[PDB]
Amino acid sequence: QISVRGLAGVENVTELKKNFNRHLHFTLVKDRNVATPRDYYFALAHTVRDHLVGRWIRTQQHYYEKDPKRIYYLSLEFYMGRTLQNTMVNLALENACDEATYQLGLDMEELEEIEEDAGLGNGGLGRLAACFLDSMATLGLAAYGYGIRYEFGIFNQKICGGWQMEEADDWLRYGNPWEKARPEFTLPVHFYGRVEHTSQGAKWVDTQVVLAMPYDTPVPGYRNNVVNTMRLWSAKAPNDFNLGGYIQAVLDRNLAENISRVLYPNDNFFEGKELRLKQEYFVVAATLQDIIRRFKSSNFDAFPDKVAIQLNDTHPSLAIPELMRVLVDLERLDWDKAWEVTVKTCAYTNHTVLPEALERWPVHLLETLLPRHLQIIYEINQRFLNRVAAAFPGDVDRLRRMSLVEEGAVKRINMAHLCIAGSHAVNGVARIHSEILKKTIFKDFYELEPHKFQNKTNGITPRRWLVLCNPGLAEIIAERIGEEYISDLDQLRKLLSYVDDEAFIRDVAKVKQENKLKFAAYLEREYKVHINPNSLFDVQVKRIHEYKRQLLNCLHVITLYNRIKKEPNKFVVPRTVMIGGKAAPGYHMAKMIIKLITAIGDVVNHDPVVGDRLRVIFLENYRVSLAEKVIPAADLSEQISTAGTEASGTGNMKFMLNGALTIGTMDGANVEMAEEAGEENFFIFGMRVEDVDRLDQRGYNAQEYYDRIPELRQIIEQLSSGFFSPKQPDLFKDIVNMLMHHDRFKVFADYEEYVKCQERVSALYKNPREWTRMVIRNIATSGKFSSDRTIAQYAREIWGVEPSRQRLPA
């Protein structure tokens, strides 16, 4: 149908049809008489998978022949979403499979909906790793993603009586056709035990063993025949494990295998839980043995020339002392040489500044679980602090600030300090964030080793986040400027010369309208929800956290409602306000915020005076597959975190690429987005980082704002008095209390500017032609935010490898 979806050749369509029937018969053991749509999905997935394997085998053979420097991206999260469509896109098979399935009497889009998300992440950090894998393959890098194969990913969210309920995400129930188990590369991982000192060095003995079994998933590059590997480890008990009586010993194997059972959902809130530490060591120990094995199958002086390890936050930070352990205790390198190799091999990416998100492990846990690692960490600390002392003599305060060991009630190890000490590069994820790291929380480290500190502004893959989710937009762009922009997104700048083209303006607006109709219908179908598709689609989707300020959005929604009720016969631009996202199960305030949003909906959506002028919908179970639907449909993207709190953001970039305008604070990557598009083409409001600092110096007093802004006072009185919870009038008292007395994120301080900025949005939306022209200026300048640009920068400035756009042969 559309050109960017590739060719449907007679030969290709014929071959796909016959391979589909082969799999249905031999693989699934069904015939057309009893087959369900799920059977048909699986037959298609196996058919597409067959096209990967030749390229997969020869890519890995190629790396063996050429022996390039290998990049190892270590992460506890890979938020991959669905794989079928992505694979078809990257292999140029979409139109062919569409034709083939159509000729079999099947609708491919219906089959696509059957696949489960691989929801092995919480949000931005996990999704970044997934975008990165796609870009690394597209740029021809010899890259491997390493993580954990969780049996249960991020929970499925149900809303019952306006409250979040969690259920287990049993994503593997029907099988996963994309992975290949590799039980033959199973490796042992050690826990507990004790350290013995011999004449011939230290020995870690009397350990418990858990096995790490790998599962490999292919990662196809865009139309270059490169297929890289994501290797995820699964925990297995050894067969003599624990070996009445006999029965209980077999049942107790679950203790070991629980390591890979479930993803922790409490993102941005560190807890010192033993099981989480076991997960972190498990991925690190198995991965490093795999790395060393592959390196030997070609003297460790050359190790950093052949290996780069990228740490996705501190979660895999134990790689540093584990590499030292292996080099010193097993390979018998002297300490100094091992440390040189380690530093040159490892690099660390920081993704947070909130103090409660930093990993600070109690020493007593490390002592029991990983006694040799604690010893190595103490030794690293002593040598590092000796360097600090020599560079800043007499500065005893600096010594305690920079220590890897935190003194206090409970002694803790600061894993961020360990990563900085043990890495040759440390980066933040947007310019403002990287500057904040050097000026505040890692100031001391920057003063000691300025050369370590870099910026790598985040990005998103334009394959999933434009071609896959918004083919209509991809097509009208390709009509004007060709197809090359899909792997060179800076070419979108060429669209500036169409900002006054009447045909293009109409097509851009038509594509948005079609997306909005499609989404409005999805809403009715799957959730009996009933929206006006002519309204402005005002969308805030991301995890629920106080710093992200879903509450500020709520205050605006109630302001609009109150204004309508005050002057009901006045014209207002109609809106559909959609808020979505998961709350961490133990985060009470986040759970109350979800309840508030649904409670506002209950009042607003049933008030006959409002009509269809305002609707408030909570988008249930926000995840990658839902993002692919709602983002192309959005008019307005809400990026309204308190300045200094969102390290980068990546949802922001997805909305920009798909034709929404942005209302946002000067936080994270919003700053660079506004800089690229022009501030006149962005709806910027609120305190800058400098203003937040000034307020903190004086002291934030929320009462001052309540006293001076009558519209705000009205809302607080409504919340307090039970207007939004008539049967339980005190329901939202915790929210009101926090807002008035303990608000770390200064919701009231940006309220007035936010409401005024929202008025300017509504004014522009009344003039469709000028709205759309501003959209074109956003899409056209979104090129910097391709993860291909990001990865090219990691490759040249951190890993020391050159990207390539050249095809491997088919």
Next chain:
Amino acid sequence: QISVRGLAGVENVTELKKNFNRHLHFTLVKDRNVATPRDYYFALAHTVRDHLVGRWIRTQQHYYEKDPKRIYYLSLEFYMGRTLQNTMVNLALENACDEATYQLGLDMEELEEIEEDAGLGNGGLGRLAACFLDSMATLGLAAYGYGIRYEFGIFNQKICGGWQMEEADDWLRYGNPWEKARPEFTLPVHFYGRVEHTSQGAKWVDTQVVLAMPYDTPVPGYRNNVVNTMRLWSAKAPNDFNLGGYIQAVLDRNLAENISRVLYPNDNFFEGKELRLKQEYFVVAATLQDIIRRFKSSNFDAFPDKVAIQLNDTHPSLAIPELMRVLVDLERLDWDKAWEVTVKTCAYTNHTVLPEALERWPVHLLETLLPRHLQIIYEINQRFLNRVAAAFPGDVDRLRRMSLVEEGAVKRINMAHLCIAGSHAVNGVARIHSEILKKTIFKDFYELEPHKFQNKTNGITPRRWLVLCNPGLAEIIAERIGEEYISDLDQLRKLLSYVDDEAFIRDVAKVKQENKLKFAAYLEREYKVHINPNSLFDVQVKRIHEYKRQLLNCLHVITLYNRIKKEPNKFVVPRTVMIGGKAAPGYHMAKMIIKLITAIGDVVNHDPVVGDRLRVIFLENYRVSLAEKVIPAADLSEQISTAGTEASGTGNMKFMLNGALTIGTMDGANVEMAEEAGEENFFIFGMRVEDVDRLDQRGYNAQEYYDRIPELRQIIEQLSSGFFSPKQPDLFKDIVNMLMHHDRFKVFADYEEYVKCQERVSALYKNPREWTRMVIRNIATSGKFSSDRTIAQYAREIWGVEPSRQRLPA
């Protein structure tokens, strides 16, 4: 190479080779450069599996079209062993696959050794179910085997310092290419809760739910294109199960899923464990929903015309009250009509007379776990006892003897009594056993309902137990009498006319010699054990139990040793005595017996005066795949249980078919074997059942035998004094104590007759020609012991269906 292995056509060999390469590439994702022998095994298994699926689909379609009466064989155990060779045999593919793999530079026999046993049983009962499935498919019956997919089957046995050690049988580690998961036919199973009585009947409410997910394995008939199904259930937690905190709730899913984790290994010893009861109900509840679903997809008056349920012992006895529950509580049939349907549907096979093997569940367990079933069982009991009272008025003792409820310290339900009450047929498994049931333990029931009681003498499948394991013997037989005997084993009688044929005599003896050389070499290869292949191979393999009297064998071994030491320069027929089998992990006496056997080996095998005249070897990890190797190599089969204790035996039949002579008591099927071959062609010794009864009446006094038999006294003095355990002189005191004071199985009473009979064996073995002639007379009369004969009898006399030997079309 050999004719019974089928044709190696050019077209077939070419197609197999290309499909093998296809699977290696696309299925396994390997190439010839990195492939291991395990990869090659899997490529072959997938290639052979492809040949099953067409026949599997069309067999099941055929049953849907014709709607024949369906046979459901319910068992907690299916001891299947390996599947690759069996599949090749039944599909006539063995020579073709041999040729194909040879042309690829691979040895097929080496690849066969890589497959794990499906060890989902303990011994005879589990293996009988497997032989039965093979015969039911071969006889064209619409039969389904239903059981539990244990994650861990019978433990792997290691011997360390002469002691049994257990390790988990992780048989699914590398995957199982034969099974097909069917998550779409998942069914709920209920536990706990309570019963509510409404006006509209009883209701079972407030239950915990566990899901039963089926996995289907194909069961091919012999060269008839029938492929039946074995459906095994796996336990899964529902996704809201139990739904910090959140993490613990996800980890606690293991509680539910433990139901299918592990096979209980304590055969012949009943324990009232809750988990075992859960397993029993799980298989019954899921299976019966499946049965009813299939019946409706065509009024319950016709249910027994379309359904037969065979209970493999009492382990699935809850089928009776579950069927009543469904018919009465859910389908709203009146009690009497439901009971009529149930009785006509169900039939029960008894496999034991030892009292400690009978299932007698504490009422308090049923009360908590299955409260509605207990109510139904009480109601069944009251109505049954009312019939007993009317037939035998005033006989109050009979009422308490026949009750399903056993009064005492703890009240118990006798599941055997429940099965007899609720079944239209009850059978034993050999003539003597079925007679014992009517005369002793079920005498009262036989007097009430004589028509229910039948015999069905056990059998073994001649596919696995001759063609597969002993192709050399199968071939020399086929040369004389053709191939038809493989599915009509009575044709072996034709071999009687070759008992004086010099060519045949030589070939029979040559085949045995080759088998013995092959096994002697397997022993050296895999266990550094070093045997004389000219010796008589004297073999006792079966689970270790006091009733089976491995101890009697031990006493003979020590007698032979002592006789040699007494007259070392006298000639004796050389022997290799092999004993093998697993002991239940908590059965102390069985564990001591294994230790005694290895301890005797330690002395005998290193005594220079003995030389190679006597060797004693303990065969480690006895299982189906090992039976297939040792049985074809055996000269003498030890079947020496105390008369009245072995219900049938089936190992006995395997040895007879493969050219070993039998030394045995008149117990179980030995009686019928001797009757078929002629007592003159069997080595029968010892007390008959009647003699054991006479001894019990007088009182068994072991001291009497010790006092009168000097050779026996010598052995007991050697055991007691530490001759076989010099560093631990009191090691075997428990054994000596049991033998002298508490021997339920009268080992001493058969000692003298056993030793004398063994002398007659040695005399015959000195005359190879006459030994071999007696062998031919055994092989020639083994036809009755085909499980095809057994199943034909179940079909006609219990299930009411006619067997068929007719092909389905290919």
